[PDB]
Design an enzyme around this catalytic site. Structure first.
Site, PDB file in Angstrom:
ATOM      1  N   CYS A   1       0.967  -2.021  -1.326  1.00  0.00           N
ATOM      2  CA  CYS A   1       1.333  -0.601  -1.314  1.00  0.00           C
ATOM      3  C   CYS A   1       0.343   0.263  -2.093  1.00  0.00           C
ATOM      4  CB  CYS A   1       2.769  -0.362  -1.822  1.00  0.00           C
ATOM      5  SG  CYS A   1       3.017  -0.613  -3.616  1.00  0.00           S
TER       6      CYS A   1
ATOM      7  N   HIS B   1       6.818   0.672  -6.121  1.00  0.00           N
ATOM      8  CA  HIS B   1       6.390   0.944  -4.759  1.00  0.00           C
ATOM      9  C   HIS B   1       5.930   2.383  -4.667  1.00  0.00           C
ATOM     10  CE1 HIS B   1       6.772   1.250  -0.212  1.00  0.00           C
ATOM     11  NE2 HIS B   1       6.074   0.150  -0.421  1.00  0.00           N
TER      12      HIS B   1
END
EC number: 3.4.19.11
Length: 158
Positions: free
Chosen positions: A29, A90
């Site tokens: 990510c 994230h």
């Protein structure tokens, strides 16, 4: 092209790049977001998702809602959705588009978790993040729009 087409373009272009050499961005990510920022010329905090969120919290304007986040993306700004995790955080790029459940904007992101953490613009942040997390997201926006004027040759309605 739409005013924000450069954002989606950078997302598409970043998918199969490997910001961390050896690891495809679709599986990372932080790397995905770094490659998008690099294409757009936006300075970004370094490190893993948690470190990036720390850096964004310190230096970027924060938006009040996912709705605002989509609105800013639609104007050609880079908008990052982020949340720290106890082990791993994230981060995702917010793009213009309909809000899922009238609240959660569309996004692009990669993830080492695999498909559950991946979106090529087809999932909202409210589908990528856990139900226990999607209402706790932070939305950060860069100070200048990244996209340019449309091509001068463009014929459009008045």
């Amino acid at each position: 092209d739409s005013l924000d087409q450069c954002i989606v373009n950078a997302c598409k272009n970043s998918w199969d790049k490997s910001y961390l050499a050896g690891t495809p961005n679709k599986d990372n990510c932080s790397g995905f977001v770094q490659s998008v920022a690099a294409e757009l010329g936006v300075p970004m905090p370094r490190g893993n998702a948690n470190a990036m969120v720390d850096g964004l919290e310190q230096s970027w304007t924060k938006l009040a809602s996912g709705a605002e986040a989509a609105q800013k993306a639609a104007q050609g700004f880079l908008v990052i959705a982020g949340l720290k995790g106890r082990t791993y955080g994230h981060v995702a790029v917010v793009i213009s588009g309909p809000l899922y459940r009238q609240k959660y904007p569309m996004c692009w992101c990669g993830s080492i978790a695999g498909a559950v953490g991946q979106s090529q613009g087809l999932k909202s942040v409210g589908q990528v993040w856990n139900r226990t997390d999607r209402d706790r997201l932070n939305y950060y926006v860069y100070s200048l729009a990244s996209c340019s004027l449309p091509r001068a040759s463009l014929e459009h309605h008045h």
